[PDB]
Scaffold this active site. Structure first.
Site, PDB file in Angstrom:
ATOM      1  N   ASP A  93      23.526 -69.033  -7.740  1.00 53.79           N
ATOM      2  CA  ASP A  93      23.665 -69.940  -8.952  1.00 53.79           C
ATOM      3  C   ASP A  93      24.963 -69.186  -9.780  1.00 53.79           C
ATOM      4  O   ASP A  93      24.686 -69.577 -11.587  1.00 53.79           O
ATOM      5  CB  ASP A  93      22.221 -69.690  -9.779  1.00 53.79           C
ATOM      6  CG  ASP A  93      21.345 -70.269  -8.314  1.00 53.79           C
ATOM      7  OD1 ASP A  93      20.577 -69.297  -8.762  1.00 53.79           O
ATOM      8  OD2 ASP A  93      21.707 -71.381  -7.910  1.00 53.79           O
ATOM      9  N   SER A 118      27.465 -68.582 -15.181  1.00 53.97           N
ATOM     10  CA  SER A 118      25.534 -68.389 -14.896  1.00 53.97           C
ATOM     11  C   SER A 118      25.082 -69.674 -15.273  1.00 53.97           C
ATOM     12  O   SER A 118      25.407 -70.024 -16.478  1.00 53.97           O
ATOM     13  CB  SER A 118      24.908 -67.197 -15.301  1.00 53.97           C
ATOM     14  OG  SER A 118      23.799 -67.308 -15.327  1.00 53.97           O
ATOM     15  N   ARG A 119      25.021 -70.232 -14.362  1.00 53.36           N
ATOM     16  CA  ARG A 119      24.482 -71.820 -14.374  1.00 53.36           C
ATOM     17  C   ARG A 119      23.169 -71.948 -14.727  1.00 53.36           C
ATOM     18  O   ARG A 119      23.067 -72.790 -15.293  1.00 53.36           O
ATOM     19  CB  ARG A 119      24.625 -72.326 -13.004  1.00 53.36           C
ATOM     20  CG  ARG A 119      26.645 -72.317 -12.422  1.00 53.36           C
ATOM     21  CD  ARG A 119      26.380 -73.168 -13.517  1.00 53.36           C
ATOM     22  NE  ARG A 119      28.106 -73.350 -13.253  1.00 53.36           N
ATOM     23  CZ  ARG A 119      29.047 -73.046 -12.612  1.00 53.36           C
ATOM     24  NH1 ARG A 119      28.880 -73.064 -11.352  1.00 53.36           N
ATOM     25  NH2 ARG A 119      30.342 -73.028 -13.355  1.00 53.36           N
ATOM     26  N   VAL A 120      22.414 -70.824 -14.974  1.00 54.15           N
ATOM     27  CA  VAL A 120      20.616 -71.164 -15.271  1.00 54.15           C
ATOM     28  C   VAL A 120      21.315 -71.543 -16.443  1.00 54.15           C
ATOM     29  O   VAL A 120      20.180 -72.172 -17.750  1.00 54.15           O
ATOM     30  CB  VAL A 120      19.775 -70.253 -14.480  1.00 54.15           C
ATOM     31  CG1 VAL A 120      19.400 -70.258 -13.031  1.00 54.15           C
ATOM     32  CG2 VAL A 120      19.669 -69.058 -15.563  1.00 54.15           C
TER      33      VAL A 120
END
Lengths: 171, 136, 284, 117, 86, 117
Positions: A93, A118-120
């Site tokens: 992620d 950071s893809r969150v």
């Protein structure tokens, strides 16, 4: 949980595969090398309270469990495109890209903005930090190229000299 | 009051509305008040006195020049170095000399120097046109 | 060949593209500043030319050698050139225009003399055997009138001494950020350039000491100032030409990357195929 | 093992100093090529002079290379290495010529060799 | 790569140098000999050290040859001595 | 067979001169590709201008290729071609446009073709 250098689990798996004559694949890593790291990293999950309450048969009811994973990978001279690194980049992620140039230059930890992400996103970030840090990332991403234009240019517009000073401060 | 310009070949040194100036003209010191008749003179090096309107004095240093006056315009075509047959001839002698010995001074542009150096090193033994099959 | 050579070359060309883009930016700023310094010169020359209009052309006039159209036996050129390369064809177009006209002149048997501003022209005419009598070099991006006094003094001293009969300045003219042009323009004998002081019949100066002594220095300073104006317009034209040339070079690099990455991908695929066929057909 | 905690600040700082001086001399070489030496500032010429003297001083004659060169080998203790590089960077030896540093061994031998050259 | 590992030295012959006219085309910058100075006559041992250094400085400067006219005579001396020894 | 012993000095020397020019032209194609032809030294512009002529003068129309291009084929004798290349290299046809050399026989058909554009 922190796996130190999956780059070496891949190699150990390649060895114990080729010893068994199992047919090869790109770079000689056995066919299912993606399904080696995948079925591992997909266990790092945040599991909701009904799965917990079922698994534990009622003994705990409110909670949500979770398991964070920080795998480590070892590129060859910054070659993100090699086989295994791009397998794992495709599973996780985000990535924290540690840059050799900044590390040698004394910037430790040598986190490289821009190419790391950071893809969150901010959903994971405590409120105060989401407020104060919202600008830092892209401001630094721009400063690092502005200070690369710098060396071929004395006599800078001070509308940009303020920026090259602020960026140097924060760095 | 009157409008005064002090201007050099390179740049402008002063502009404004003035009450008087006191000036070391070549054949003896001079003073310009408003309405002064049309006049033209060379001047010697030294401090000119300016009295700006509402009386605010300031000085300027001139290395020479020509002062010229018209109905409402006065201007001083100052110049940037001491001009004189003593000095101009030395300059011209040096300029002739450099044509003989075939000297060339380096420019001072350190940024162009560094950029051109990095460019020359980056572009060396690149051999790309042999590698990409582009004909040219 | 092989992936690890071509990726190194791609890296180096991308670095080159960084360099040239930075140089384009720098030149684009210096053009703006040099054109400001260009526009900071007009007042002096214009007012002095009005004064010379009144004093020399006038309703009465003063015999001066620089005004009269005497016979031509040899001709001087003041040549402006850059001190720095990467300017595109600017210098060579200028030198070819000069050489064509100096040929046309010497076809009437007149000799010619060169005074060089800038080192590039110095080298060129040392090579082509021109008659360089004086030079100044290394002014860079800070031209100053005081440095020009030397060569223009030489050319004036030779003109009044009768050794020269006509004097030209040869330089680029800045017109647009996208277009500049090389020009050869006369400055001695002084051109006839309108500025009719007939209107100014109403008044005349108190000359102190006398009109002839003043007129001499007025013409000397005016010639010096037109040479300085020419130097500054040439500097601004150099910065415009370097900007457009670095632009073109950055787009050339950007296309060469497209070629190299196709070669690179082909090598990547071929190395994967020949590795995997060597392994599989090496079992059994 | 090159971090202050283990080598001591004296050593760590001497090492980083040498690295800084060389890394700036690399910048300066390609100005010196295009413009010549004289356009440098006074401290840039002093940095170049110290960087060359350090680059020379890192050379050393070996008791086993003694057959190739002939020149007798030298052993240099770490104290003398740090004292030499710090003394060069602090300018204590700016009065010796560059060749005096080459292949001497210890820094006192640099000071001695400079006399005869 | 095997025989480069086994032997004591290498004479690398370059097709570019061979085309440009340099014949024999030995590439001095990557050719080596690990017996080296030990095997020469001492006149040659004495004299060739300076050729080594002349060519090494020439190979470091060579990148500028395509901008040479812009260079400084303090280096133009070296950049021409390299070409003459070559 | 390309030895002085065999083809004689003049032919060997012409061939090697042609190779030297064409190689020097290859070494420039990268800088020409990036920065354009204007950044070359004033003598390199001449190398390029001669190589681009040598390339064409190596062209020849063939009797069997009349089918494709109409133009009648040519037979060129050796004596008659080493002279032409020696000429181009020595810069005595250095006032003629490039396309004067494209698809011609001896150097005299080129000097003719120039007149007609």
């Amino acid at each position: 949980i922190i796996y130190d250098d999956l780059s070496k689990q891949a190699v150990a798996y390649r060895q114990i595969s080729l010893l068994l004559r199992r047919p090869p694949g790109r770079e000689a890593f056995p066919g299912d090398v993606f399904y080696l790291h995948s079925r591992l990293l997909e266990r790092a999950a945040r599991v909701n309270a009904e799965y917990v309450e079922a698994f534990t048969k009622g003994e705990v009811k409110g909670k949500t469990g979770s398991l964070t994973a920080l795998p480590i990978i070892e590129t060859q001279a910054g070659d993100v495109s090699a086989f295994v690194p791009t397998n794992v980049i495709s599973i996780t992620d985000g990535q924290i890209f540690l840059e050799t140039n900044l590390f040698n230059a004394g910037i430790r930890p040598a986190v490289n903005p821009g190419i790391s992400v950071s893809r969150v996103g901010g959903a994971a970030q405590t409120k105060i930090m989401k407020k104060l840090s919202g600008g830092i990332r892209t401001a630094l991403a721009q400063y690092r190229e502005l200070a690369a234009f710098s060396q071929f240019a004395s006599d800078l517009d001070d509308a940009t000299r303020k920026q090259l000073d602020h960026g140097q401060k924060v760095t | 009051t009157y409008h005064l310009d002090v201007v050099s070949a390179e740049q402008q040194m002063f502009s404004g509305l003035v009450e008087k100036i006191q000036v070391t003209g070549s054949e003896g010191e001079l003073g310009i008040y408003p309405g002064h008749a049309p006049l033209l003179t060379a001047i010697k090096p030294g401090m000119i006195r300016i009295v700006k309107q509402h009386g605010h004095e300031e000085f300027i240093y001139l290395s020479g020049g020509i002062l010229e006056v018209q109905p409402g315009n006065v201007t001083v075509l100052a110049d940037t170095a001491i001009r004189g047959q003593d000095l101009d001839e030395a300059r011209a002698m040096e300029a002739k000399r450099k044509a003989e010995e075939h000297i060339s001074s380096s420019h001072g542009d350190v940024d162009y120097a560094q950029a051109s150096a990095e460019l020359a090193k980056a572009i060396a033994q690149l051999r790309v046109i042999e590698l990409t099959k582009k004909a040219m | 060949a092989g992936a690890k050579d071509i990726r190194s070359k791609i890296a180096s060309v991308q670095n080159t593209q960084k360099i040239t883009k930075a140089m384009e930016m720098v030149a684009a700023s210096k053009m703006r500043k040099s054109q400001d310094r260009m526009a900071a010169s007009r007042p002096y020359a214009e007012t002095m030319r009005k004064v010379i209009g009144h004093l020399a052309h006038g309703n009465l006039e003063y015999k001066h050698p620089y005004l009269e159209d005497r016979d031509v036996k040899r001709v001087g050129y003041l040549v402006v050139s850059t001190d720095r390369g990467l300017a595109g064809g600017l210098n060579i177009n200028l030198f070819k225009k000069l050489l064509a006209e100096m040929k046309t002149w010497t076809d009437k048997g007149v000799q010619a003399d060169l005074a060089m501003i800038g080192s590039k022209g110095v080298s060129f005419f040392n090579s082509v055997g021109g008659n360089v009598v004086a030079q100044v070099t290394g002014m860079g991006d800070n031209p100053s009138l005081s440095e020009l006094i030397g060569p223009v003094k030489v050319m004036l001293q030779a003109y009044d001494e009768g050794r020269l009969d006509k004097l030209y300045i040869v330089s680029n003219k800045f017109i647009n950020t996208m277009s500049q042009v090389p020009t050869i323009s006369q400055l001695l004998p002084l051109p006839a350039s309108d500025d009719d002081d007939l209107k100014h019949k109403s008044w005349d100066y108190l000359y102190e000491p006398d009109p002839k002594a003043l007129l001499d220095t007025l013409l000397r300073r005016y010639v010096e100032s037109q040479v300085y104006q020419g130097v500054v317009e040439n500097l601004a034209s150099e910065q415009a030409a370097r900007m457009v040339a670095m632009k073109a070079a950055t787009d050339n690099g950007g296309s060469l990357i497209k070629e190299l990455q196709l070669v690179y991908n082909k090598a990547r695929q071929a190395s994967i195929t020949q590795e995997l066929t060597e392994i599989v057909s090496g079992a059994a | 093992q090159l971090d202050p905690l283990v080598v001591g600040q004296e050593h760590y700082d001497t090492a980083r100093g040498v690295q800084s001086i060389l890394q700036r001399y690399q910048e300066l070489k390609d100005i010196i090529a295009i413009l010549g030496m004289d356009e440098l500032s006074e401290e840039d010429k002093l940095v170049v002079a110290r960087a060359r003297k350090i680059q020379r001083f890192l050379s050393q004659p070996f008791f086993v290379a003694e057959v190739f060169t002939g020149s007798p080998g030298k052993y240099v203790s770490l104290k003398d290495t740090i004292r030499g590089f710090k003394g060069i960077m602090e300018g204590e030896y700016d009065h010796l010529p560059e060749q005096a540093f080459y292949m001497v061994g210890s820094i006192e031998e640099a000071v001695e060799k400079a006399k005869k050259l």
